[PDB]
Amino acid sequence: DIITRPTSDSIAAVANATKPAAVVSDPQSM
Amino acid sequence: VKAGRTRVLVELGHYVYTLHYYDPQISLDEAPILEEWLSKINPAGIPPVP
Protein backbone atom coordinates (compact mmCIF):
# COMPACT_ATOMS: atom_id res chain seq x y z
CA ASP A 1 0.00 0.00 0.00
CA ILE A 2 1.03 3.61 -0.60
CA ILE A 3 -0.34 7.04 0.28
CA THR A 4 -2.09 8.58 -2.72
CA ARG A 5 -4.96 11.03 -3.03
CA PRO A 6 -7.08 12.23 -5.95
CA THR A 7 -6.10 15.56 -7.42
CA SER A 8 -8.45 18.52 -7.18
CA ASP A 9 -11.34 18.16 -9.60
CA SER A 10 -10.59 21.45 -11.35
CA ILE A 11 -7.04 20.37 -12.20
CA ALA A 12 -8.17 16.97 -13.46
CA ALA A 13 -10.81 18.53 -15.71
CA VAL A 14 -8.44 20.94 -17.45
CA ALA A 15 -5.72 18.29 -17.67
CA ASN A 16 -8.02 15.80 -19.37
CA ALA A 17 -9.13 18.47 -21.84
CA THR A 18 -5.71 18.72 -23.50
CA LYS A 19 -4.71 15.15 -24.37
CA PRO A 20 -3.95 14.71 -28.08
CA ALA A 21 -3.87 11.26 -29.62
CA ALA A 22 -0.40 9.75 -29.47
CA VAL A 23 -0.77 7.64 -32.63
CA VAL A 24 -2.78 8.78 -35.65
CA SER A 25 -3.39 7.39 -39.14
CA ASP A 26 -1.24 9.40 -41.54
CA PRO A 27 -1.06 8.06 -45.10
CA GLN A 28 2.43 9.55 -45.42
CA SER A 29 5.74 8.48 -43.87
CA MET A 30 8.29 9.27 -46.62
CA VAL B 1 16.01 8.39 -37.02
CA LYS B 2 15.44 4.70 -37.69
CA ALA B 3 17.27 5.20 -40.94
CA GLY B 4 20.85 6.28 -40.42
CA ARG B 5 20.11 9.91 -41.25
CA THR B 6 19.18 11.70 -38.01
CA ARG B 7 20.37 11.95 -34.42
CA VAL B 8 18.12 13.38 -31.72
CA LEU B 9 18.93 14.65 -28.23
CA VAL B 10 16.05 14.75 -25.75
CA GLU B 11 16.67 17.12 -22.85
CA LEU B 12 15.40 15.52 -19.66
CA GLY B 13 16.40 16.68 -16.22
CA HIS B 14 15.60 13.48 -14.37
CA TYR B 15 13.36 10.56 -15.16
CA VAL B 16 12.23 7.09 -14.19
CA TYR B 17 14.09 4.47 -16.20
CA THR B 18 13.37 0.81 -16.86
CA LEU B 19 15.54 -1.70 -18.66
CA HIS B 20 15.32 -5.09 -20.35
CA TYR B 21 17.97 -7.80 -20.43
CA TYR B 22 18.42 -9.72 -23.67
CA ASP B 23 20.57 -12.58 -24.88
CA PRO B 24 23.67 -11.62 -26.89
CA GLN B 25 23.17 -14.62 -29.18
CA ILE B 26 19.79 -13.42 -30.48
CA SER B 27 19.71 -10.83 -33.25
CA LEU B 28 16.90 -8.31 -32.93
CA ASP B 29 15.76 -4.80 -33.79
CA GLU B 30 14.69 -2.77 -30.77
CA ALA B 31 12.54 -0.25 -32.64
CA PRO B 32 9.21 -1.68 -31.34
CA ILE B 33 10.19 -0.97 -27.73
CA LEU B 34 10.75 2.71 -28.48
CA GLU B 35 7.59 2.95 -30.57
CA GLU B 36 5.60 1.52 -27.69
CA TRP B 37 7.27 4.02 -25.38
CA LEU B 38 6.37 6.84 -27.76
CA SER B 39 2.81 5.55 -27.99
CA LYS B 40 2.09 6.56 -24.37
CA ILE B 41 3.62 10.04 -24.21
CA ASN B 42 1.21 12.95 -23.87
CA PRO B 43 1.30 16.53 -22.56
CA ALA B 44 0.26 15.16 -19.16
CA GLY B 45 3.12 12.74 -18.52
CA ILE B 46 5.43 10.06 -19.86
CA PRO B 47 6.13 6.41 -19.19
CA PRO B 48 9.57 5.33 -17.95
CA VAL B 49 12.40 5.30 -20.45
CA PRO B 50 13.27 1.76 -21.60
Binding site: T7, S8, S10, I11, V14, A15, T18 | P43, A44
Partner: protein, 50 residues
Protein backbone atom coordinates in the same frame (compact mmCIF):
# COMPACT_ATOMS: atom_id res chain seq x y z
CA UNK C 1 -38.43 44.52 -39.31
CA UNK C 2 -39.20 45.93 -35.88
CA UNK C 3 -41.39 48.82 -37.06
CA UNK C 4 -43.07 50.16 -40.19
CA UNK C 5 -42.79 46.71 -41.73
CA UNK C 6 -45.56 44.56 -40.23
CA UNK C 7 -48.14 44.51 -42.99
CA UNK C 8 -46.53 46.86 -45.48
CA UNK C 9 -43.64 44.98 -47.10
CA UNK C 10 -43.21 41.41 -48.25
CA UNK C 11 -41.71 38.69 -46.08
CA UNK C 12 -38.63 38.67 -48.33
CA UNK C 13 -38.05 42.44 -48.52
CA UNK C 14 -36.87 45.17 -46.19
CA UNK C 15 -38.11 48.73 -46.05
CA UNK C 16 -35.34 50.99 -47.40
CA UNK C 17 -37.14 54.16 -46.31
CA UNK C 18 -37.24 53.19 -42.61
CA UNK C 19 -33.73 51.78 -42.33
CA UNK C 20 -32.44 54.21 -39.71
CA UNK C 21 -35.21 53.51 -37.21
CA UNK C 22 -34.96 49.74 -37.54
CA UNK C 23 -31.19 49.84 -37.15
CA UNK C 24 -31.52 52.03 -34.08
CA UNK C 25 -34.02 49.68 -32.48
CA UNK C 26 -31.85 46.67 -33.29
CA UNK C 27 -28.86 48.28 -31.61
CA UNK C 28 -31.02 49.14 -28.60
CA UNK C 29 -31.94 45.48 -28.22
CA UNK C 30 -28.28 44.60 -28.64
CA UNK C 31 -27.43 46.98 -25.82
CA UNK C 32 -30.15 45.83 -23.44
CA UNK C 33 -29.21 42.20 -24.00
CA UNK C 34 -25.72 42.70 -22.54
CA UNK C 35 -26.70 44.37 -19.27
CA UNK C 36 -25.03 41.85 -16.97
CA UNK C 37 -22.40 41.46 -14.28
CA UNK C 38 -19.22 39.65 -15.31
CA UNK C 39 -19.05 37.28 -12.36
CA UNK C 40 -15.86 35.54 -11.34
CA UNK C 41 -15.36 31.77 -11.42
CA UNK C 42 -12.98 29.07 -10.21
CA UNK C 43 -9.44 29.81 -11.32
CA UNK C 44 -6.94 26.98 -11.36
CA UNK C 45 -3.48 26.09 -12.61
CA UNK C 46 -2.62 23.42 -15.17
CA UNK C 47 -0.03 20.72 -14.55
CA UNK C 48 0.19 20.25 -18.30
CA UNK C 49 3.42 20.99 -20.13
CA UNK C 50 1.64 23.65 -22.20
Amino acid sequence: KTVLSRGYIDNAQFNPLALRSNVLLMLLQFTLSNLKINKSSTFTSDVTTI
